[PDB]
Coordinates of C-alpha atoms in Angstrom, one line a residue:
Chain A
X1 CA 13.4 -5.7 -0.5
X2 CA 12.1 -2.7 1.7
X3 CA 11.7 -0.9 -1.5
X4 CA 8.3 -3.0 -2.1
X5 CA 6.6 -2.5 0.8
X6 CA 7.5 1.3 0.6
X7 CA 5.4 2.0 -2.2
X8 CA 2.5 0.0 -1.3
X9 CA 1.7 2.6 1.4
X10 CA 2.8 6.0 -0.4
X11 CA 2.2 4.7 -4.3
X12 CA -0.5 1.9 -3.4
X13 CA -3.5 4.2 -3.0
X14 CA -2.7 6.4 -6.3
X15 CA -2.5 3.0 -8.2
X16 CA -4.7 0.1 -9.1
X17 CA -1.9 -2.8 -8.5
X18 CA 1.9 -2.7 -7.8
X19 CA 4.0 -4.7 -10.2
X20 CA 6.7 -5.7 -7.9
X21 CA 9.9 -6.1 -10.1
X22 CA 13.3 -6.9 -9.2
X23 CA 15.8 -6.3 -12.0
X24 CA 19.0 -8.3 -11.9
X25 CA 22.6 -7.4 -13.1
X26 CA 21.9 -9.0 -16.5
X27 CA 19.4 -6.7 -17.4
X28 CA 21.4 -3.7 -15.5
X29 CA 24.3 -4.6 -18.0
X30 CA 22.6 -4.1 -20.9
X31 CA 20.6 -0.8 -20.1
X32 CA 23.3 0.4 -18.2
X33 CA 22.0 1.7 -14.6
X34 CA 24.5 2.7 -12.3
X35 CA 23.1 2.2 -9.2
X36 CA 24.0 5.3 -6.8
X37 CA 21.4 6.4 -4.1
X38 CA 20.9 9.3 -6.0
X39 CA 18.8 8.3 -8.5
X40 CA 15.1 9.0 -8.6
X41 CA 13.0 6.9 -10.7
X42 CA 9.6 8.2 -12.7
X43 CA 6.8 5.7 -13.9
X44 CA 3.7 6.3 -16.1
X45 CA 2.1 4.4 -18.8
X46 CA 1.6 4.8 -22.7
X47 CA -2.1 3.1 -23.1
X48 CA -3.4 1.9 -26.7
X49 CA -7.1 2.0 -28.6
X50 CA -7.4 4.7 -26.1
X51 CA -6.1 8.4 -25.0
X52 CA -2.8 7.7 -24.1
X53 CA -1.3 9.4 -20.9
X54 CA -1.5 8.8 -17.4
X55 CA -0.2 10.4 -14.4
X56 CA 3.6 10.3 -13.6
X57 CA 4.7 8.5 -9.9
X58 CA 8.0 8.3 -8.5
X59 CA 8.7 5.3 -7.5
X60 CA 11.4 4.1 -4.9
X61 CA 14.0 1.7 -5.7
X62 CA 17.1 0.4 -3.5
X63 CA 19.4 -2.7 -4.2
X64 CA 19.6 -5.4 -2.8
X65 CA 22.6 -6.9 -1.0
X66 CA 22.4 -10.6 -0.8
X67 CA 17.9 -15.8 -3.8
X68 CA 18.0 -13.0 -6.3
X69 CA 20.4 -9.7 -6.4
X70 CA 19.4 -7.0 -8.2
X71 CA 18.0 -3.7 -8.5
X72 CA 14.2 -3.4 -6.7
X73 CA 11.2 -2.0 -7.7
X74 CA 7.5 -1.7 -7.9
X75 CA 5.6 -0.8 -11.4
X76 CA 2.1 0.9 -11.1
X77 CA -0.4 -0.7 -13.1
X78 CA -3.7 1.2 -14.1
X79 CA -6.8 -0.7 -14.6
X80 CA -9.1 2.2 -16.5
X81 CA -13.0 0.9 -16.7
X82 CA -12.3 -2.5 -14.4
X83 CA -9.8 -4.1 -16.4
X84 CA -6.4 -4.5 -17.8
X85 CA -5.3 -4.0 -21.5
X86 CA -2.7 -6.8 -22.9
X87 CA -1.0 -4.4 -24.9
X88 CA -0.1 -1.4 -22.7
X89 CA 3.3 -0.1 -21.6
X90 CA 4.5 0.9 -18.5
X91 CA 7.5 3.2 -19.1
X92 CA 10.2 3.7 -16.3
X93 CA 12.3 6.6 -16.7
X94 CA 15.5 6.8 -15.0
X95 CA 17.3 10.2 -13.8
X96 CA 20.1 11.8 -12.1
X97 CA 18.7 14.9 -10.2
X98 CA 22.3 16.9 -10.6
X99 CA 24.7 15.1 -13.3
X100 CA 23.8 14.2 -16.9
X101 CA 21.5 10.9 -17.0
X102 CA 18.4 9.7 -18.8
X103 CA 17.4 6.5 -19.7
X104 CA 13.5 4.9 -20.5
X105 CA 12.9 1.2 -19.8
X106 CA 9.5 0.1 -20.8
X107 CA 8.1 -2.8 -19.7
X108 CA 4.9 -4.5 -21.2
X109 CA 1.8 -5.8 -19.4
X110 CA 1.5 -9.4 -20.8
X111 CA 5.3 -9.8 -19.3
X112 CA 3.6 -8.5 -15.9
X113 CA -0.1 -9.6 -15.5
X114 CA 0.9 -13.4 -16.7
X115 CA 3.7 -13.6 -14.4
X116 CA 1.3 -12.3 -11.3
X117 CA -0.6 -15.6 -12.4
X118 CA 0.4 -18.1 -9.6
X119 CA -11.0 4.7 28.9
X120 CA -8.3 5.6 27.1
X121 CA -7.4 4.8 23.5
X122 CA -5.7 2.8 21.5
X123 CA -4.1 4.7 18.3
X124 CA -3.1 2.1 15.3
X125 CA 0.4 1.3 15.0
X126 CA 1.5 0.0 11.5
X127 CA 5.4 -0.2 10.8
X128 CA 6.5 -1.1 7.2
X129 CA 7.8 -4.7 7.1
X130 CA 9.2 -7.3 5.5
X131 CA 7.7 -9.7 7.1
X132 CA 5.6 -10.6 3.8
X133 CA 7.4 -13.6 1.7
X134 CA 7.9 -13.3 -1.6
X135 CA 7.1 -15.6 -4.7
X136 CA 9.9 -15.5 -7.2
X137 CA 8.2 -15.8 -10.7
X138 CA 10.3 -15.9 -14.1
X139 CA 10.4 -13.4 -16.7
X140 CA 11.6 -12.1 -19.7
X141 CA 11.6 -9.0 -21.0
X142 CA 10.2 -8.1 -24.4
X143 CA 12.1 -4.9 -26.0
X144 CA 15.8 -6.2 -25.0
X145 CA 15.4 -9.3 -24.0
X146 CA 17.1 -9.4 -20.8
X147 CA 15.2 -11.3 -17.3
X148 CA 14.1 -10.1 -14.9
X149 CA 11.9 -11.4 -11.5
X150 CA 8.7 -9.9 -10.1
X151 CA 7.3 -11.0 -6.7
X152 CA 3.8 -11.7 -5.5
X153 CA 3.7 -11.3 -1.9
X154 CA 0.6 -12.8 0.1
X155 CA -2.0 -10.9 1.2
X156 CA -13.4 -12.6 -5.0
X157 CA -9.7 -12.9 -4.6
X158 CA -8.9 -16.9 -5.1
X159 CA -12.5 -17.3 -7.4
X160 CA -11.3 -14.8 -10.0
X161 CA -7.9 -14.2 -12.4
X162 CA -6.5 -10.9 -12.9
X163 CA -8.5 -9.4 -15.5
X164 CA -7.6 -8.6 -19.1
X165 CA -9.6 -7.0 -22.0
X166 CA -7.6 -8.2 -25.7
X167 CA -8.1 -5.9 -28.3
X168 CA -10.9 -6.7 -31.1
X169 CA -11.3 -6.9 -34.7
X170 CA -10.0 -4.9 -37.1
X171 CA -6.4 -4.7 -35.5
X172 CA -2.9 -4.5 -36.9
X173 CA -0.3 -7.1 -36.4
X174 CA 0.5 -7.3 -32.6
X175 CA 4.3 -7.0 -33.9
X176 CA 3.5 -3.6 -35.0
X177 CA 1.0 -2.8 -31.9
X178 CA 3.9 -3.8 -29.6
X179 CA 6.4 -1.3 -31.5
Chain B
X1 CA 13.3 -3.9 -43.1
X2 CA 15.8 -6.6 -42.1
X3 CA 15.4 -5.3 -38.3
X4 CA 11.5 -5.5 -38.9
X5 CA 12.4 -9.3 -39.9
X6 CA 13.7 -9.8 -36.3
X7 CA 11.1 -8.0 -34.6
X8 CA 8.0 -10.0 -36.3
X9 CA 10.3 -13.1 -35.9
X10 CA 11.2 -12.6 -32.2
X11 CA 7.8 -10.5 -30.8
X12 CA 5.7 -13.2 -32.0
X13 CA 7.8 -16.1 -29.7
X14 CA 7.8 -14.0 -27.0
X15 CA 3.9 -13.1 -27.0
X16 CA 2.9 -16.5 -27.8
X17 CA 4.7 -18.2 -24.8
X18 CA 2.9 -15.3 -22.7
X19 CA -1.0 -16.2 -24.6
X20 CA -0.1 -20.0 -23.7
X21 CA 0.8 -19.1 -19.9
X22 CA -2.3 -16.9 -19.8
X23 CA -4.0 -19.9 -21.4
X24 CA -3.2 -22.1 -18.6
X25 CA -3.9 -19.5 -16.1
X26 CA -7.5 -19.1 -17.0
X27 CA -7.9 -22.8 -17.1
X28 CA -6.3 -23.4 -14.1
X29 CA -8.7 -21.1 -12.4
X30 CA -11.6 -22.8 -13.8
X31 CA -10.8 -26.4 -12.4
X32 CA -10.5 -24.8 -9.2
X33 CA -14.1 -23.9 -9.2
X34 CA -14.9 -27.5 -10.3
X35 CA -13.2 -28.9 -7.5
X36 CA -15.2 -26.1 -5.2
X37 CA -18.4 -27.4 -6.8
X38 CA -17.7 -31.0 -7.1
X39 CA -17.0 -30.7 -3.5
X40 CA -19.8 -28.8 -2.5
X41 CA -22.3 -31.7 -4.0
X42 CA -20.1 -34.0 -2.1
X43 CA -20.8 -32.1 1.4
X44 CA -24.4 -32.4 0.7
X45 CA -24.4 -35.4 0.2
X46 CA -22.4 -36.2 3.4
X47 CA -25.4 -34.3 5.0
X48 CA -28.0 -36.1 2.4
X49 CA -29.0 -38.4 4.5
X50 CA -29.8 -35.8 7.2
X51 CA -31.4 -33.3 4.8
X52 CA -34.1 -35.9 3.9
X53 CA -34.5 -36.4 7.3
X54 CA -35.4 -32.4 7.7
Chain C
X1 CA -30.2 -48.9 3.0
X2 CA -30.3 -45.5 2.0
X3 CA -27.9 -44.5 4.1
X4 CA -25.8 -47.5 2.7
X5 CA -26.6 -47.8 -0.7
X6 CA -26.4 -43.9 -1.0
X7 CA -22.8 -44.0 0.8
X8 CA -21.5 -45.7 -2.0
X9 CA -23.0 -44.6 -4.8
X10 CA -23.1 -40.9 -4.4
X11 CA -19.3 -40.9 -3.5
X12 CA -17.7 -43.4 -5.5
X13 CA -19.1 -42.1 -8.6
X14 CA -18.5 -38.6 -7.5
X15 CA -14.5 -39.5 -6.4
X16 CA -13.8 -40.9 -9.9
X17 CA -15.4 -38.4 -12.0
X18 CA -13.4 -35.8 -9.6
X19 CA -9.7 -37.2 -10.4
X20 CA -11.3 -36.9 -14.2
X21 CA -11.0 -32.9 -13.8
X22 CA -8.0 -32.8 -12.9
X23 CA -6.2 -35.0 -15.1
X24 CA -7.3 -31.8 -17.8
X25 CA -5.5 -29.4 -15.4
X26 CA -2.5 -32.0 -15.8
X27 CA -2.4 -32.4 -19.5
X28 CA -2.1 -28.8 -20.4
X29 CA 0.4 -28.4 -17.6
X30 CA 2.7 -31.6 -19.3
X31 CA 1.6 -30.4 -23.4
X32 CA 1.3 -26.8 -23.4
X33 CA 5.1 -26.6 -21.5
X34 CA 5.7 -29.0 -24.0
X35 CA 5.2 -27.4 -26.9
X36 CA 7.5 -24.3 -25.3
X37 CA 10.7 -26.0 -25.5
X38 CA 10.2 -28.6 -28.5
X39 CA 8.9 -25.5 -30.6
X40 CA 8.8 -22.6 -29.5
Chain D
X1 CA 28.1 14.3 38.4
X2 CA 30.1 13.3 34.6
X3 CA 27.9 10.4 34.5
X4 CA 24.8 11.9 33.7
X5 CA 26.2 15.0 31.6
X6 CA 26.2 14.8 28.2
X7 CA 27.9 17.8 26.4
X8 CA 27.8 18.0 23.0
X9 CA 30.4 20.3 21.9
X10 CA 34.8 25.9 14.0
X11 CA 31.4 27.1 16.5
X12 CA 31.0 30.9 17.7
X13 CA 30.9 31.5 21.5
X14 CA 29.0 34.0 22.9
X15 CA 29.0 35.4 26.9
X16 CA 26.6 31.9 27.2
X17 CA 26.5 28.1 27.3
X18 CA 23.4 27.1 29.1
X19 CA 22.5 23.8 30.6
X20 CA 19.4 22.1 29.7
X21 CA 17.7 19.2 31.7
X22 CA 16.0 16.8 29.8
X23 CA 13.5 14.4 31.9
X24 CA 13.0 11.0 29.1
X25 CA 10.3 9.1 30.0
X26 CA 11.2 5.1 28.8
X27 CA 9.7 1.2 30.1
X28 CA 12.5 -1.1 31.4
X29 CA 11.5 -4.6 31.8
X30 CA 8.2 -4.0 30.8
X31 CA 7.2 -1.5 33.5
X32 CA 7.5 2.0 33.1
X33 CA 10.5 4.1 34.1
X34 CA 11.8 6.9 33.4
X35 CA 15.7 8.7 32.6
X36 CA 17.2 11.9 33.3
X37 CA 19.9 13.4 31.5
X38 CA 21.8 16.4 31.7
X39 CA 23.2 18.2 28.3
X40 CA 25.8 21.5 27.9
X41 CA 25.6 23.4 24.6
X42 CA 25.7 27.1 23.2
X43 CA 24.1 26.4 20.1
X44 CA 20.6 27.7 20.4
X45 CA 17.1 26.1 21.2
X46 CA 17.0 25.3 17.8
X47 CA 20.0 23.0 17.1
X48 CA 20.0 21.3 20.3
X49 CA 16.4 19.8 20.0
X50 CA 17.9 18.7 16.6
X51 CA 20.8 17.5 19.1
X52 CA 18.4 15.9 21.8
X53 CA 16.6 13.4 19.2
X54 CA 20.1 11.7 18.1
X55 CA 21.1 11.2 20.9
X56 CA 17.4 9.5 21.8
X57 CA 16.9 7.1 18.8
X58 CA 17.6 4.1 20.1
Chain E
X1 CA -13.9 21.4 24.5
X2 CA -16.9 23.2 26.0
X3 CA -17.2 25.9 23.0
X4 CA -16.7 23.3 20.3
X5 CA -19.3 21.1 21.3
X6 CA -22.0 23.6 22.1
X7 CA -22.2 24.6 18.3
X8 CA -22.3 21.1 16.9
X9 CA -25.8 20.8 19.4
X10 CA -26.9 24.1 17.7
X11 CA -27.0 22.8 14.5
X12 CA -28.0 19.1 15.1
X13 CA -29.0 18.6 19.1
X14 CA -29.4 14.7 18.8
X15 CA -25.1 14.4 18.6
X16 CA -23.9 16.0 22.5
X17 CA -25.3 14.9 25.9
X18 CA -25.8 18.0 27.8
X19 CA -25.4 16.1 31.1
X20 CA -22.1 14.4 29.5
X21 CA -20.5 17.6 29.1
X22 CA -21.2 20.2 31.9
X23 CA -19.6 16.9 34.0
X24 CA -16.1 17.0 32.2
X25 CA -15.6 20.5 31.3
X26 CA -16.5 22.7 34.6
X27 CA -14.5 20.4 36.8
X28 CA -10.8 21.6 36.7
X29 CA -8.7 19.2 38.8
X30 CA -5.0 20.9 39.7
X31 CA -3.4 20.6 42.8
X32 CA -5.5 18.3 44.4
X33 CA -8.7 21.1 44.3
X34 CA -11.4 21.3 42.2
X35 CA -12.3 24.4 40.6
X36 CA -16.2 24.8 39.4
X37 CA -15.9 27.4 37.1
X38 CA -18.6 29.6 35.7
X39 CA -20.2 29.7 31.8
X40 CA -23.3 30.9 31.1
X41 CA -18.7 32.4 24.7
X42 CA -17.3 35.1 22.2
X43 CA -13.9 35.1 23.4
X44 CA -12.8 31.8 22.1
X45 CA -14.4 32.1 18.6
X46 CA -10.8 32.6 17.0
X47 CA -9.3 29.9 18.4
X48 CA -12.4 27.2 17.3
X49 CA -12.4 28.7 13.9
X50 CA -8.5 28.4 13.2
X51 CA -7.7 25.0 15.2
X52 CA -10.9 23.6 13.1
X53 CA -9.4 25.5 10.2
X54 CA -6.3 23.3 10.7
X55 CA -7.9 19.9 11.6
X56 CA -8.5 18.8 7.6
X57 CA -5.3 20.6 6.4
X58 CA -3.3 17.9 9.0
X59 CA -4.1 14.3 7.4
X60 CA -3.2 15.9 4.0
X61 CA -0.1 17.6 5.0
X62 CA 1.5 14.5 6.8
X63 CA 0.9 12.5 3.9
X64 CA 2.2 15.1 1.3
X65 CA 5.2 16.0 3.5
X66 CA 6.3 12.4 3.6
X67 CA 5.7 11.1 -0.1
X68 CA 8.0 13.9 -0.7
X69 CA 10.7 13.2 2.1
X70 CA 11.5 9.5 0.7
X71 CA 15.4 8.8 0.0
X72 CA 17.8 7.1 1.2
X73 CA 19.1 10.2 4.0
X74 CA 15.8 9.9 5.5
X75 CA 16.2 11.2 9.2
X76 CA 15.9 7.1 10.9
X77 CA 13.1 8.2 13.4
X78 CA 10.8 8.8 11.1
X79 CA 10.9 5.5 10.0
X80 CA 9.4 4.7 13.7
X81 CA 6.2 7.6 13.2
X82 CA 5.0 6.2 10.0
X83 CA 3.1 3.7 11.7
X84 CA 1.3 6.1 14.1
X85 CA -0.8 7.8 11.1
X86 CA -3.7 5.9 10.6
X87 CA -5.3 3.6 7.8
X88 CA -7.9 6.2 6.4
X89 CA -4.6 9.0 6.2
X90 CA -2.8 6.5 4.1
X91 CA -5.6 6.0 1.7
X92 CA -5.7 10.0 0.4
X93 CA -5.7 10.6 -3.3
X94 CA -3.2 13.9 -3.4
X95 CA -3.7 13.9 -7.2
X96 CA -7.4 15.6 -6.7
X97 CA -5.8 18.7 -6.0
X98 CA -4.5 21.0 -8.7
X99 CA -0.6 22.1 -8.1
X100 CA -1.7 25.9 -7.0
X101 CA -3.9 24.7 -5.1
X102 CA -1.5 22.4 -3.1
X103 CA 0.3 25.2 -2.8
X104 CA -2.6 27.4 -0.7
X105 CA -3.0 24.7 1.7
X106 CA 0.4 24.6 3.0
X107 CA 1.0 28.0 3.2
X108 CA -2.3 28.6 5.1
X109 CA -1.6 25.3 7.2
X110 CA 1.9 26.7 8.1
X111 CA 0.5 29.7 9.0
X112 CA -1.8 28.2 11.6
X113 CA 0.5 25.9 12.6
X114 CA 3.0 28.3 14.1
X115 CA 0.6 31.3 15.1
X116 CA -1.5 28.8 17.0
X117 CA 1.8 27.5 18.3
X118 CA 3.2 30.7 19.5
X119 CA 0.4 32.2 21.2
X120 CA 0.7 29.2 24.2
X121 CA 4.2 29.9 24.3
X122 CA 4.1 33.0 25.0
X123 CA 6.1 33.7 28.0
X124 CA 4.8 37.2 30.3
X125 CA 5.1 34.6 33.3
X126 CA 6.6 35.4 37.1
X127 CA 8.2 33.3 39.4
X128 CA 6.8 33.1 42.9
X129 CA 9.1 31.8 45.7
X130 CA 7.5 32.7 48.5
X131 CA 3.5 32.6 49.4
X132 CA 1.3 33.2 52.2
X133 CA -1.9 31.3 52.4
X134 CA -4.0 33.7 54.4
X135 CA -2.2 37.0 54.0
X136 CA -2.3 35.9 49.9
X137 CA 1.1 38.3 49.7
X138 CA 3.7 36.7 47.4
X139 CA 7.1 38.1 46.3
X140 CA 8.3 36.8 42.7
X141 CA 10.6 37.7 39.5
X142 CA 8.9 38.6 36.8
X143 CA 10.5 37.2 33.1
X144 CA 9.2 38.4 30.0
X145 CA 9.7 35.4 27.0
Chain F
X1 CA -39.0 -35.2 0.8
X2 CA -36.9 -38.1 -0.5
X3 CA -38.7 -37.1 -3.8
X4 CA -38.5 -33.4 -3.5
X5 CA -35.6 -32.9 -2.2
X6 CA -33.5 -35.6 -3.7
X7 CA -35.3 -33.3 -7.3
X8 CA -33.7 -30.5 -6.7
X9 CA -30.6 -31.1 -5.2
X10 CA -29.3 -33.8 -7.3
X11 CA -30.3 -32.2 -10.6
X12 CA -29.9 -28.6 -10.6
X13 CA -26.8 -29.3 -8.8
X14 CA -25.4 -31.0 -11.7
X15 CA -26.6 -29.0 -14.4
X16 CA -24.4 -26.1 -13.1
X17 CA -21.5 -28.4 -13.2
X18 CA -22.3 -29.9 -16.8
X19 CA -22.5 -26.3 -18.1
X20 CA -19.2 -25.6 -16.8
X21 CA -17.5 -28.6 -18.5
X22 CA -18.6 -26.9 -21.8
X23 CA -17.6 -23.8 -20.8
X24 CA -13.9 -25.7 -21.2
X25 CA -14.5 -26.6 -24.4
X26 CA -15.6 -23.1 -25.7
X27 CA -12.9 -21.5 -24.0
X28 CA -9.9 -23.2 -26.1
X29 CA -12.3 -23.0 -29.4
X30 CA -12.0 -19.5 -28.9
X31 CA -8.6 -18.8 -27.6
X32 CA -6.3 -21.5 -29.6
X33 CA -8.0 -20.3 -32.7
X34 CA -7.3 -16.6 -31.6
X35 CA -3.6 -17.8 -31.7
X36 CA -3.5 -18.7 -34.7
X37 CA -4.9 -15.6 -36.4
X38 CA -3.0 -12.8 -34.0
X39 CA 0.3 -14.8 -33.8
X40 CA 0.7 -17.6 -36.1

């Protein structure tokens, strides 16, 4: 649960939000993530209707020892021209720096955005903290199916929702825009 | 094609249960500023009869 | 008796036309969570 | 005095082991006051800096 | 202090206070004495161009040594100093740099990091332990480094 | 100013509210009938 806070200091500014995710043993079975201290995670997004590449950030995760349990992390999302896309993955690649180990989780925004819907002087001194509470919201995700949390920690912010932008007529199928 | 069966059966439960939250979301957000204007007349009008009054 | 008259008028109307927006914000919260696990 | 040395010793040896005197400034009870400790090592200006800071976290 | 600020009043006068600054600098206080020392300085236009040289390479390279240095071995008092950089250092976009070019401001930055450092220690110093006041004869030790 | 005031408060006050009731009614004309075309 240090592993949010982290990366809204050191990946905060090079994003637009932080999807805080924390991944429980369910969806670790199925993916199979075997959680040493060694790993280092990668995240960067696949956009749609668009040119599709953004910048890769590495992202910190640590698990947690316990009311969840589970693996911790926090997802950058990138809002290009003011907005979010519904249809937009956010792809988390998982590596070993020495031994043999590559997987790819993607995760997709609608499974992220909806579940964010609820004299001398004195020098600055700001510790990281979990002093924040967290806000344990449900979801599922799409590709295997497994669930997974995501936390909204408290801080035009109550007036407005988190924006989206849904793609226009003509389309294909949003079956075959998802895969 | 028997795997694209399952993928049109089960991606089109699991978006529509995420439209129908977002659904909610956005109207949720919109009876909030009801209540902040229905409210606001209502402080006015607490304050009416001292507004006329200038 | 404006400030009587007023008093009650211009909050009484105003209190039940208020619990009236938010018995929208309650039916879609009871129906559209309905329709999840009966249908969906 | 052993009280206030603090030595922190496979390692070479040379014709040396200096003594260093390390003056920690600290606050007890909410007032400022300061410590003085004394350390015993051959290891080189580098290390025992390195050496210093451990022993000074808390 | 004193050579800094008398070039940022050469190019724009209306940002130093002339008689804020000859009241702070000539003063020297050691010992209990104060020294009035004597400016009318071209001796000191090394040190102003590379400790100004360093003071913009400093908020990037704290930033970009530490989003680096995250793990789970990281050293437990630096844990303490990431609270003493400031809000604006923790809002720098490092991805506005190209890669060789992150490259040429860290090797520059080292490089006036330690020669700036090693130039104040340097150690031609002598020991006096003995000192007349009015004879001003003094014995000493000299130690070089 | 009972006139005036009461003229402008009391109307344009509620003509922002009225349009925002409608507002309610567009919004599900437009999003429960994108349902049905995207996903259904």
């Amino acid at each position: 649960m240090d592993a949010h806070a982290i990366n809204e200091r050191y990946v905060g500014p090079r994003c637009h939000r932080l999807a805080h995710v924390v991944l429980p043993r369910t969806f670790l079975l199925h993916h199979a993530i075997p959680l040493e201290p060694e790993i280092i995670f990668s995240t960067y997004t696949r956009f749609s209707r668009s040119p599709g590449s953004s910048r890769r950030l590495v992202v910190c995760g640590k698990r947690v020892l316990p009311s969840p349990s589970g693996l911790a992390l926090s997802l950058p999302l990138f809002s290009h021209d003011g907005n979010f896309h519904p249809f937009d993955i956010s792809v988390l690649r998982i590596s070993c720096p020495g031994s043999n180990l590559s997987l790819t989780v993607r995760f997709l925004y609608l499974s992220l955005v909806v579940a964010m819907g609820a004299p001398p002087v004195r020098l600055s001194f700001n510790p990281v903290n979990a002093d924040v509470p967290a806000t344990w919201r449900d979801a599922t995700n799409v590709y295997s199916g497994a669930p997974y949390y995501v936390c909204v920690y408290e801080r035009e912010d109550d007036w407005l929702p988190i924006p989206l932008s849904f793609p226009e007529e003509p389309v294909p199928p949003p079956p075959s825009l998802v895969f | 094609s028997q795997l694209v069966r399952n993928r049109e059966r089960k991606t089109k439960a699991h978006l529509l249960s995420l439209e129908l939250d977002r659904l909610v979301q956005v109207h949720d957000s919109r009876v909030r500023v009801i209540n902040a204007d229905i409210d606001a007349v209502k402080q006015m009008i607490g304050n009416m009869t001292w507004s006329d009054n200038i | 008796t404006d400030i009587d008259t007023a008093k009650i008028t211009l909050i009484s109307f105003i209190r039940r036309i208020k619990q009236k927006v938010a018995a929208l914000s309650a039916s879609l919260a009871e129906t559209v969570d309905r329709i999840k696990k009966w249908y969906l | 005095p052993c009280d206030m040395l603090v030595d922190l010793d496979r390692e070479p040896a040379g014709l040396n082991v200096t003594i260093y005197a390390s003056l920690v400034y600290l606050r007890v009870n909410q007032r400022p006051s300061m410590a003085l400790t004394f350390f015993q090592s051959g290891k080189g200006f580098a290390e025992v800096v390195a050496m210093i800071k451990d022993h000074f976290t808390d | 202090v004193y050579h800094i600020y008398s070039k940022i009043s050469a190019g724009a006068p209306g940002d130093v206070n002339m008689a804020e600054l000859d009241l702070y600098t000539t003063n020297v206080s050691f010992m209990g004495r104060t020294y009035r020392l004597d400016v009318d300085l071209r001796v000191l236009d090394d040190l102003s161009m590379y400790l100004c040289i360093l003071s913009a390479l400093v908020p990037r390279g704290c930033l970009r040594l530490l989003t680096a240095l995250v793990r789970h071995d990281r050293h437990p008092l630096t844990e303490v100093f990431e609270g003493v950089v400031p809000d604006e250092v923790t809002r720098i976009d490092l991805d506005q740099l190209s890669v060789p070019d992150d490259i040429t401001r860290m090797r520059v930055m080292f490089s006036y990091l330690q020669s700036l450092s090693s130039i104040f220690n340097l150690g031609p110093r002598l020991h006096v332990y003995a000192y007349s006041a009015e004879t001003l004869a003094a014995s000493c030790w000299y130690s070089p480094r």
